[PDB]
Amino acid sequence: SGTTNTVAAYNLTWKSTNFKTILEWEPKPVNQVYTVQISTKSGDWKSKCFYTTDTECDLTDEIVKDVKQTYLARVFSYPAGNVESTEPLYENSPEFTPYLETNLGQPTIQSFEQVGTKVNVTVEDERTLVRRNNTFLSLRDVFGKDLIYTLYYWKSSGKKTAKTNTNEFLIDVDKGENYCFSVQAVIPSRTVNRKSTDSPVECMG
């Protein structure tokens, strides 16, 4: 029931970080190919990956068209090769809302600049593939005030912390002390996937 040649795809999973988005599924095809389509939750379907043997499909170009929209992908299975193919099989993916679901990638400290008794720590603002006219938006451009970074700092018991909705921190440091720093990205308004991992440590020295 449902052919002799084809097997319906399963375990449809969205892999997404900083809006770069890939749909993955099973199984590695045996005498079949797949065609993946995308649509907004109740919109029309659009084919993106045609008759392929891969088990993943980069859907970044479509999902960035409106990051606050909810998308659905569907994977069809088609017989491949010299066969007697006996309404092809397909499976729909879980819903995906890029703005609320894409994972925050690990941050990077761009630099620190000690100015007298103060230290300015700047966080790298990463480019993304989300477009606005003829430019790509940075991560901070996309989230705006929704994105907050936490700076963890200490000299060598416990770490002090500071927060910001921009890409820099200006802190007061103890004289004659080399401080180490790490930053973490957080979107407090999310309910799931709220934080990134901590950035690699960078120290004054």
Compute how many residues bind its own copies; rule: CB under 8 A. Answer: 16
Considering the complex, state which of residue 35 and residue 182 has its C-beta at the smaller distance from its own copies.
Answer: 35
Q: Does 85 bind its own copies (CB under 8 A)?
A: yes
* Stretch binding its own copies (CB under 8 A), from 41-49, 121-129, 157-165, 169-177: 41-49
Q: Binding string to its own copies for residues 20 to 39, with x set by CB under 8 A, is what?
A: -------------x------
Q: Is the peptide bond before 200 cis (omega within 30 degrees of 0)?
A: no
Residues 6+ apart with CB under 8 A from 77: 6, 7, 8, 9, 29, 32, 33, 34, 88, 89, 90
Structural tokens at position 3: 């052919």
Instruction: Supply φ then ψ for residue 100, to 5 degrees.
Output: -95, -15
**What gap in Å lies between CA 166 and CA 140, rounded to an integer?**
8
* Tokens 């909810």, located at residue: 70
Considering the complex, state which of residue 81 and residue 205 has its C-beta at the smaller distance from its own copies.
Answer: 81
Q: Does 58 bind its own copies (CB under 8 A)?
A: yes
Q: Does 9 bind its own copies (CB under 8 A)?
A: no
Q: Does 51 bind its own copies (CB under 8 A)?
A: yes
Considering the complex, state which of residue 81 and residue 158 has its C-beta at the smaller distance from its own copies.
Answer: 81
* Stretch binding its own copies (CB under 8 A), from 77-85, 135-143, 151-159, 169-177: 77-85
The 3-state DSSP class for residue 101 equals helix
